[PDB]
Ligand binder design. Structure first.
Ligand SMILES: *[C@@H]1O[C@H](CO)[C@@H](O)[C@H](O)[C@H]1NC(C)=O
Lengths: 48, 48
């Protein structure tokens, strides 16, 4: 709440079933490899 | 012949099959979606 940023982007999508945990930096799997890949130095948070 | 085996042994008497003197194609197990988890320690699954 105190810090400030130049821009923020909100990427919204739905995932069902297992692998929901795979949305995290440096993770492997069908979802992380073919569907949505996060950068190694990603700074932010994932809410589900 | 190991992964599509008819019946697996109990954990008290686990089986140990030795695989040798052959060409081992590891691409089928990696791309096949039939596995629920595939986590490798020591070596990366994509350079195998
Ligand atoms: C062995 O298992 C694979 C796994 O999909 C299957 O495609 C193949 O038909 C099976 N073969 C036999 C002889 O059980």
């Amino acid at each position: 709440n105190d810090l400030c940023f130049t821009n923020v982007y909100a990427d919204s999508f739905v995932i069902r079933g297992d692998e929901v945990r795979q949305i995290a930096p440096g993770q492997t799997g069908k979802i992380a490899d073919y569907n949505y890949k996060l950068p190694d130095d990603f700074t932010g948070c994932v809410i589900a | 012949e190991v992964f599509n085996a008819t019946r697996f042994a109990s954990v008290y008497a686990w089986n140990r099959k030795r695989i040798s003197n052959c060409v081992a194609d590891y691409s089928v197990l990696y791309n096949s979606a039939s596995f629920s988890t595939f986590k490798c320690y020591g070596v990366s699954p994509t350079k195998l």
